[PDB]
Design an enzyme around this catalytic site. Sequence first.
Site, PDB file in Angstrom:
ATOM      1  N   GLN A 180      13.851  22.162  38.446  1.00 46.38           N
ATOM      2  CA  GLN A 180      12.856  23.211  38.274  1.00 46.38           C
ATOM      3  C   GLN A 180      11.589  22.885  39.056  1.00 46.38           C
ATOM      4  O   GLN A 180      10.479  23.096  38.570  1.00 46.38           O
ATOM      5  CB  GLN A 180      12.531  23.375  36.798  1.00 46.38           C
ATOM      6  N   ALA A 199       9.386  23.008  42.920  1.00 41.84           N
ATOM      7  CA  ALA A 199       8.679  24.067  43.629  1.00 41.84           C
ATOM      8  C   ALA A 199       9.674  24.815  44.502  1.00 41.84           C
ATOM      9  O   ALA A 199       9.360  25.867  45.059  1.00 41.84           O
ATOM     10  CB  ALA A 199       7.566  23.476  44.489  1.00 41.84           C
ATOM     11  N   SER A 200      10.877  24.261  44.619  1.00 38.44           N
ATOM     12  CA  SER A 200      11.934  24.874  45.415  1.00 38.44           C
ATOM     13  C   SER A 200      12.483  26.079  44.658  1.00 38.44           C
ATOM     14  O   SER A 200      13.102  26.970  45.240  1.00 38.44           O
ATOM     15  CB  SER A 200      13.047  23.861  45.675  1.00 38.44           C
ATOM     16  N   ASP A 215      16.581  16.219  58.439  1.00 45.30           N
ATOM     17  CA  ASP A 215      16.169  15.564  57.208  1.00 45.30           C
ATOM     18  C   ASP A 215      17.356  14.872  56.566  1.00 45.30           C
ATOM     19  O   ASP A 215      17.621  15.005  55.372  1.00 45.30           O
ATOM     20  CB  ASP A 215      15.509  16.540  56.229  1.00 45.30           C
TER      21      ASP A 215
END
EC number: 2.7.11.1
Length: 293
Positions: free
Chosen positions: A30, A32-33, A141
């Site tokens: 939960q 900020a994505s 990444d």
Amino acid sequence: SDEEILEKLRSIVSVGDPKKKYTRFEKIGQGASGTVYTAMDVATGQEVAIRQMNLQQQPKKELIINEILVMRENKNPNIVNYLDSYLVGDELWVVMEYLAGGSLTDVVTETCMDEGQIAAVCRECLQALEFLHSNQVIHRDIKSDNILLGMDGSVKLTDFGFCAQITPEQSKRSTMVGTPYWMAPEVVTRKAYGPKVDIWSLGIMAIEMIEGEPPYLNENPLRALYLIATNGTPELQNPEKLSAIFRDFLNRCLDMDVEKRGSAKELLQHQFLKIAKPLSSLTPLIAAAKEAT
């Protein structure tokens, strides 16, 4: 424009609400994505992972659109499958397959991989990279956190939130988007880097599998970047404990000279990969890391 972005997403997504297609929702992450839930496709039975985001509170929505478009057109056995997306108002839902074996990070921090197991993971990651690089996509990444594992030992790359698409023209990038500790020297030093930044990151991931963490993890991210750029290729704590072929493989992934560094296509032929054990050899480690959590 927020408006144009919505029309763009509208064209991409499947119609309607997802609440019919999936059932037993369970909230996991939960951040900020967005809010991530596990759930079940009612029609196939497949357990999936669904990310729900409130658009008006999502900063760079172009990256989300890019992520979906790239995933949709670059399906591969070694990439976590993008299944569908839905838009309900400003609420965007992205549905991915769910891998129940956690991430490679859990395995390298809770277990001790042998060279045969490490070679298997390296091979599967190189398969994804060769495919992406051959299709002009740089992940940018690569790190254990972005390698998800199936209970059967499947190894899949995920998170295309930072990828780049290149061309003959605009063959090189400059944007510093990857995670500090896994970044290639050229990203921080000099500008214009290419696909081989993912190869360097893979070498750092191999160090994670050997030592439990990437070099300099203990350092402030800002300091690690300077060290990476000024120390060059990382030094192993106990190199003598590794086989000569694994050391050669690491040396090829972590060479400073980009021209000299191995390409994905070249490394897929490396003899270190030939000692890979069957992927199911990973199951005991994945099970152990899941319970340890």
